[PDB]
Symmetry: D2
Subunit: 339 residues, 4 copies
């Protein structure tokens, strides 16, 4: 089978032939039709994180396709089912985290496109219990970006604890942000879109943002304090010292600041201010199988749509470069099918 593979860190991926994966107990073979490209795939290829991935490595944790064959012991899935393989490739299913609906925290978890081969190929071996079905009226292309970006923003909003009618600030209207705006509105929330590019803010208004503000042209925190009395919660998709400080300052007392990004720096927080204002700082990444199913259901109902650009597997290295230079508006989905 054809596949994009990382043979050495920081070296371009090679599109070559590799063995077609074989399956056994509790697994399924998935023929990949599409796979979203995530910033995490880039860091995997560059091995710039503390816990480095395996090598060689087939990246991709936003791979969607059809079940070609089921292994022994698998009863809930059948040949022909349309599914996706998310970041949480597998969990133990028996630890405290797994038994309490927090499988994403399982210490024994395997991650697709990082510790095990992913969706950047024609075929991918997957753990049957952990793949998630794709709604019937959702195309593979539309579905792919929901497997990480969509579920990630949807879960982050649930983590804020904001109920219908309350206000939330979405910092960064990019790959994750433009989707976060849509989930928030679908969840009965009022949104304040924050971003330095007016192009993005206009896009946010088209997607349902009730208010927009550019940090470069005006004080974002002050704007929200004066306009709505401070938001009930903030979701930071583009984590950086300044963005986090602004968000921390725009939330009303007792509010929550939810971080979704993955930067290598440290964020200073005022102890006096945090305690006195009862502020909460929460980190949130991806989501459980239930969260993802819910995230997909909103898409299937037409409440959420991702701005996508389709590209062939061979152009993966081009995509990574455009990503490093921030020359990507929206999300990129690779197709491994002959369109």
């Amino acid at each position: 089978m054809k596949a994009a593979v990382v043979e050495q860190f920081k070296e371009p991926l090679k599109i070559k032939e590799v063995e077609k994966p074989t399956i056994s107990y509790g697994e399924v073979l998935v023929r990949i039709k599409a796979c979203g490209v995530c910033h995490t795939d880039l860091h995997a290829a560059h091995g710039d994180w503390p816990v480095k991935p395996k090598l060689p490595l087939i990246p991709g944790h936003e791979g969607v396709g059809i079940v070609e064959e089921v292994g022994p012991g698998v009863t809930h899935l059948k040949v022909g089912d349309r599914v996706g393989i998310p970041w949480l490739y597998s969990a133990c299913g028996h630890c405290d985290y797994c038994l309490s609906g927090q499988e994403t925290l399982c210490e024994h978890q395997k991650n697709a496109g990082y510790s095990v081969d992913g969706g950047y190929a024609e075929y991918c071996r997957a753990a049957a219990d952990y793949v998630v079905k794709i709604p019937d009226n959702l195309s593979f292309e539309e579905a792919a970006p929901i497997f990480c970006a969509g579920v990630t923003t949807y879960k982050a909003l649930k983590v804020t604890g904001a109920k219908p009618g309350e206000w939330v600030a979405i910092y960064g209207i990019g790959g994750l942000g433009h989707v976060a705006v849509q989930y928030a509105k679908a969840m009965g929330l009022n949104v304040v879109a924050v971003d330095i590019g007016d192009e993005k803010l206009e896009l946010a208004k088209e997607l349902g943002a009730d208010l927009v503000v550019n940090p470069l042209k005006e004080d974002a925190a002050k704007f929200m304090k004066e306009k709505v009395g401070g938001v009930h919660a903030a979701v930071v998709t583009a984590v950086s010292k300044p963005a986090f400080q602004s968000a921390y300052n725009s939330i009303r007392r007792g509010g929550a600041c939810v971080l979704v990004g993955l930067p290598p720096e440290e964020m200073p927080i005022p102890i006096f201010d945090t305690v006195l204002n009862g502020i909460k700082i929460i980190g949130s990444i991806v989501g459980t199988r239930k969260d993802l199913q819910e995230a997909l259901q909103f898409a299937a109902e037409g409440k959420v749509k991702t701005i996508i650009e389709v590209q062939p597997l061979e152009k993966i290295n081009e995509v990574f470069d455009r990503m490093l230079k921030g020359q990507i508006n929206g999300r990129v989905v690779l197709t491994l099918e002959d369109k």
Copy 2:
């Protein structure tokens, strides 16, 4: 009436005669019998915080006594009722925070012994709706330290979200910490007491701590991972960079780190770690009227006791001096029973 008053910041308080306060609509005059001394009183006396208190100033937000008279419009309190005047002297009662049981966050709140005169006197004018009744079988001396330290630790434990059977780490077994240990046990929790002084740890064992560990003689975070698999939450009573670091490292994934202290420095937090581990950093201070009633009830039932040292109002400056030099084990309560 006699009273300890701050005439100038960083100047010793003067024990002198002052006008006996007059009351009107919605207030009560309280004859103070005792008043706990809180580190906050010291910072007020030195005016070292961004929002400085008024001057002259009668400190004290742990004042307990008897209602001498009630003003017009007050129906729930009567002459002779035993009450206390906490930090939250009064709130508006109409804003979002006040209507959703979060009166401690009201932006229009006034604070006892900071923005209005407090309990370091024979008499104190108080807002009737915000004073709290003291259980019948609880002496003024025992009740005083609950109005701040007690309710603070009790609320902080509720904020962790830890349920009976789960583990919590209490960092710093001092004024607040030795009381936190007791509330945690009364709440069905298992406790790991952390402190650099073995004297304190032995005290914690006597107070109910299930496990103890000295950071100076061993890795606290490692001890908790090995012994219990990480605590479900941590309450930091003595906030400092190293203490917060250790606490952040000893909590299991998805756990909560609750800060209670009020230090003027910044705390760096790992963004990558926080997001990946779903960790929560929450600030908590004092508590609502309901929280305080609940906290007092635990004391009245004999499940919580504060180690205290009684001292006359005249020795307030000596108490402050001993406080600055960490020459105090437990809590100090001032007695007004000597005019």
Copy 3:
């Protein structure tokens, strides 16, 4: 002032002149502009409940108007403010219910138009702390029905615990039902409207219902089990033995059945089924001041609109007549803009 008053139970109300109420500490005088007519007013007029109202009695707990004057001690309200006087006229503000955001349960509460005079008059004395401000862009006529029917259905939906994306069944699409449908959609829920009159179901579709079913033409519970797999919760606005049984049968395991109606009969519940299916039966009526402000906000944002019929005070007896014989589609609001 002019007012519609009940002098004897079961006797038509008399529209006559009466003393203009005077006010004192903590009260405000409200010039009534409109007042909604609620089934509760009818029962009050007939005194058919265990706890009978005072006599003579000026009914109405859906009165909205302008503050003509404020009494001593009132600072959050100014002459000219637009407010409403709900069923919860006043509470003690110090019992456990009142301190834990459950004021509607206060045993010492006074109710508008039942134990104290209501809005069926040109003027009404009200407790300042318990009136609720009306959003600027909401007309008195539109606001009135929200003060009881609106807040009641909104709170009932919050009580179900249904989150965005889940399914709720609304039994009865009448006075309360048609408004419930709208709040549910504004809360991110999918709705199944249930009613014996196809007219009402077509209305529900226009108001946003996702699915409709007529219990007379088909098994409602079976329909919901087949179409959505059982709703997550049900709100019964027209409580009756058959409606409750149907609702109890259409909810999925672990679901909640919320009762909003006030019938004088008893409802039999299967013990075996309830325990085995982990079903919850909850009663809900009106809402707190916070709940009402939140409910009014949705109306002000254009997400909820009540179908109303405006009638002059003099036609009150006509209205009650048409009420008893179910000759009313939607809600009736009395206008008192005459002398």
Copy 4:
């Protein structure tokens, strides 16, 4: 292997030899050391429920033993592990109930000792994913009764939502009741024990009950209203019309009445009262794997102990007889090992 089997309903069980179960994918063979006797086993033996069990039938869902062998695909369990097989023999692990930590409600569940053979034998084939490990310092005899009675009361207490410091009423201090008292105390709650036999009430006081009251010698509801102002919740272990009526009347407004019993009669509930008082009626049975692990942990910590009587498998029919006649104080556990 030896086993007690039901060949015909309402016919005495036959202790005879039967085939030793064989295992396959995802199962384990468990050598039974002990098995609790539950009232449910009796109803199974008499097939007096709507959904009748299979026949022949080896009852028992409180079976605890040693894993003698693991089937293919099982990695979380090893030979020698000490485990128990609860009522929830298995669930599908993929429906909404299973994915949201409500496995006990899975419509595809199989139940031990009812739809599949249970622990009333020397061996029992079990679903690997649904057996639960027994704490190291807990004997098989002590552990057995926790697998159903223990977890059922522990979960019911969690369902009440009562927090540390609040009051709960336990109706019926028998098999489940005496254990419920202990869990409630371990959960930081204050308990009112209710039962018609003073013998039981004295037992409850020894087990930690704060207050006791006999419905035959005084009004239980009135006693609780006067003594504590109504309990925050009630757990009815012996469901009957009078017991439920009493419980419903002793709970404070907004409180919860949790039913744990399984009677074949109907319970009438006041609609007017329930809506006005915001009372909740919740059914609760057994618990999830997580709940059971938690319940077992409390036992291992010495906070909960079951009063049990050990008897050999052969005496099962005599145990059932004494059970029908209410001649059993506490719980009975069958031993499969002579000695």
